Structures are given as C-alpha cells and as structure tokens.
C-alpha cells in the first residue's frame, strides 16, 4: 500500500473536516457527478494528526492512477505544510523531505518540476502545464515582472511568495532577480492561502505564485486579478523516489490521460468554470 503525501492547494487539493461520524459530506461536481473524496490525515507547534477529507484535481488524478495501475493507497497531508526546499549539511523539507525519508512513497500535488528536486527524486511527465504570474488587488496597477515597483522596490509596495516553495528557490538562484528576492525574503508567507488572504485584506500588494492557482482564485474572487500573462513556464509532476517500480507506468498514464482528454476534463471540472 502506497503512502501518498499531498498539500492543501485549491483547486488541486481541497481539505475539509470530516462529519461527526468520521465521513465526508456527499457533494456533486459542476456537471452533476458525485465528488470523489478520500480520507486524509494531517495536523490542524505540536502536530496532532486528525483524519480529514481530501478532494480535487490531484485527488481525482490519484484515484485514476490507482485504478489504472492497480495499487492501494493512504493519503496524508505534509506535516510542515511546505512544498519542498533544500536548505555544512543541506536538508530537504516539506513533501520532498517526506518522500526521501520514506514517510511518503509518492507526491501527488501541484509540485513544480525544477533542477533542484529532479536531482534527488524522479518526476513524471508534467500532468499540468502552467507558469508563474502575479496576483494583486483589483485597482492595483502594475505591468508585471518588469514593473518598477518590483524591480526597484521599497516598503511602499510589499510583494512576496510562499516560503520554501519552488517559487522561493526561483528568485533565490537567479542573480538577475537578487533585488526582488531580498525584498520578498522579509515578507514570504507560510501558505498560499494566507498570502492570498493577505492580498484581499491589503496587507500584501502582490503575490507571485503558480498561474493555475492564482487564475482560479481570480475566477472565484472578483476583487482579485492577475496582471500580465506568464513570465515563466512551469509544470507539475508526480513525485517518486528514483528506485520506485511504478515510475514508468505513472508517467505513461499521465501521457495517456493528456491524449484521451482526461486531463482536459479535470481542467473543466476543477479549474475552468
């Protein structure tokens, strides 16, 4: 039985409390179909683990991979709520640390493929093609990645990303972005949901994050808009250890789902409506 790790990240992974009887509420998709839900454990500082309810884009993809390749699974949230970063000795945190330490056998999450992570784990072919963009409060006028308020920043315009995410490494490794990185390091948020909430409450003036996430937020919350297109292309992939026996069939199933419209249906069910 495979131990699956994931992270709260709507619309890809929803996280709701269970009912009183330890079950998940029967709900229905935008097309009238039942929403497939799985029990996922995780913390609510000590980390007391409690069973919760998981569903969304990545959960639907996990169920497909299980039925396609005939394996059983147990899902749990990442203990430190982080995606994964390598920080004398270096150490991986987040879902990357759980996959390498054996706490998880597979990462099923909006996990960006980068050179840093691929050096230690195996990535499948991308199951989602997206990129990086900027979320702002409606009315805030900035052009994009090349706006002077970002390239020559002050304390009058605060922007940041998620701590210990692929976007965090993105601005740390590129010396051309060193000016922006030193502004964000003081304001990076613990989770995307908190940073998005900070933009709503006008505590954060710009959020640099995944476009598939930010554009979904702008579609449901009309006081938020994304500025410009994508200044960088990135993709999400299934994460396994390099010696996993499932890695080839996982990658083939990703391609098959792309080529028969299943990934597009998931995009219609969870992303674009």
């Amino acid at each position: 039985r495979l131990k699956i790790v994931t992270i709260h990240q709507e619309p890809f992974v929803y996280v709701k409390p269970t009912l009183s009887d330890g079950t998940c509420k029967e709900e229905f998709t935008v097309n009238g179909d039942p929403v497939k839900k799985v029990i996922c454990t995780g913390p609510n500082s000590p980390r007391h683990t409690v069973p919760q309810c998981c569903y969304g884009f990545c959960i639907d993809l996990l169920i497909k991979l299980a039925r396609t390749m005939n394996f059983t699974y147990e899902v749990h949230l990442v203990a430190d709520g982080k995606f994964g970063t390598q920080e004398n000795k270096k150490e991986w945190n987040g879902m990357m640390g759980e996959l390498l330490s054996g706490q998880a056998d597979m990462i099923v999450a909006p996990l960006t493929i980068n050179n840093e992570r691929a050096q230690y784990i195996e990535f499948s072919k991308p199951f989602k093609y997206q990129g990086l963009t900027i979320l702002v409060k409606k009315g805030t006028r900035i052009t994009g990645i090349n706006d002077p308020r970002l390239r020559n920043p002050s304390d009058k315009f605060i922007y940041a990303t998620v701590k210990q995410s692929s976007v965090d490494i993105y601005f740390r490794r590129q010396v051309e972005l060193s000016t922006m990185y030193r502004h964000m390091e003081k304001h990076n948020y613990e989770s995307a949901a908190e940073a998005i909430q900070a933009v709503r409450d006008n505590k954060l003036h710009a959020f640099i994050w995944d476009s598939a996430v930010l554009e979904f937020e702008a579609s449901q919350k009309c006081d938020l808009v994304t500025t410009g297109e994508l200044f960088f292309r990135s993709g999400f992939g299934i994460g396994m250890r390099k010696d996993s026996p499932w890695k080839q069939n996982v990658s083939l199933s990703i391609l098959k789902s792309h080529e028969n419209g299943f990934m597009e249906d998931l995009d219609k069910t969870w992303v674009r409506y």
């Binding site: 990535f123 072919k125 051309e176 292309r233 990658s251 083939l252 792309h258 080529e259 028969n260 419209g261």
Partner: protein, 275 residues
Amino acid sequence: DNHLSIVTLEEAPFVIVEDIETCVRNTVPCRKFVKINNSTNEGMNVKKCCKGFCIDILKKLSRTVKFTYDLYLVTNGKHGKKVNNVWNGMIGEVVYQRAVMAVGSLTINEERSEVVDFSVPFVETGISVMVSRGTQVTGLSDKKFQRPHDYSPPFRFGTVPNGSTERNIRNNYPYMHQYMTKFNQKGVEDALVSLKTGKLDAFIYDAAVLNYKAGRDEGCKLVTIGSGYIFATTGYGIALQKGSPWKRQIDLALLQFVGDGEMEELETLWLTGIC
C-alpha cells in the same frame, strides 16, 4: 563512446537546413544521405548546415553535458510512425540504435515512450487548429469536426498525416479521422496555401508550429482558435534509447537552462512573431 550519433529533421523554426564547404555562424554541420537514383541503394552524404531553436538546445546540451556529435537528417520517414509494428522516422533511428538521440520538433506521446525514452519537455506543444480569422470553431470537439456531414456543405479540414497529430485523431475521433483523410496535406506550407486560397476551412497540426506560423502570417489572417488553445498538452522532447545513460544529465541540463532564464533568449531568437 563520448562521440554520439544524433538524428534530426528539418521543420522551421526549430530545425532549419542550409547549403554550404564549412558551416558558419550559428549553424552546425549536418549530413543528409541522398540517393543516386531509384533503381539502386547507392547514395552519398551531402554535407549541409543546420540551425534553429532545437539546434541551439543541442549546442547548449553538447556544451553542458560535454559530448561531441555527428548530426544527420532522417531519410526513412519523418518524425516517427509505427508501420506494421516497425517504427520509422526519428523514433525508428533511435529504436534500432542508429542514433543515440533525436533532437527536433519531436512530440512526446505515450506510444513513443513505450519504445524510446524522452527527456523532460522543453517546448510546449500539442494539437491546435489554425483557421482564417473569424471562423466559429469552439475546439477539436466542435460538431463541425465530430459530425462533419451534419452541415451542407461540410466543413473541410485536414492535417499532415503520419505524425503525432493524426495518431491522436485516429484513436480519439474515428469518424472525424476517416472523413479527414481526403484533406491530407503534403506539408505545412501546402496547408497554409490551402487555407488562404479557400480550399481548406481548418488545419489541425502541432501546436508550436502553428503558433509560429500564426505570428508570421502576412496580414495576420490565419489564427489558432481559442487564442492559442492546445488539446492534449505535451512537449517536444529529446528521444533516447530505453535505459540511456545520457537521459539524467540531459534532463538536469534542460531544467537548469529554463531555471536560469536561458530559454528567453532562444525564444526571442527563433520564435517571435509580429502577429
């Protein structure tokens, strides 16, 4: 051993072929086997020069992964098609071990990944539909494509056969595919002329190529639907033999290229369009 046999195929702007006897500037030497006549197997390698986006990627990979190469153009087919359980094209060159890898506008799909190994995608692509500006087509699943004879006159649309695009249409839309074959185009340029002259209502083809042709169309009359929408999202990938020891280093190099912003210069060098 460290000097690799690499196959490619011409498709602008990703691989461009020129004449020459010393290749110059941003071009690298690439040979092409050209037959003497059609009554013999005799032929000779013509020394030519190759350039383009995917050639610049190969130049970067050769410098980073540290290897030299003898580049040559495929003559047995094009990109790759399985005929009678036998792969031709660039995939066939890799499957039957005549080339260590293949670089070009080579689409990653499932059935090819069964016989070769693919690097991470480095050019986003898939299936797009090019039409004259204003054509009302929702997408690949538009009823004009799915049930083409529900319209009088029926919608005229085709592709360039034997590639990844026709393979996807053959498996997903049987009725659409069998109706489509009478509109098969010999190549992209033939399809563009068929579009502009009104002989064809829609042209279904590789996403990245159509994106490039749309941005360079005279008068900007030909466009891709959905503002550049892509069905069955995938990418161009370096093909390698299954279990190739070069794959890991190729992947890390490609991810390092995009991670440090090196792709933007190759994009502005080859892929820009006025439209």
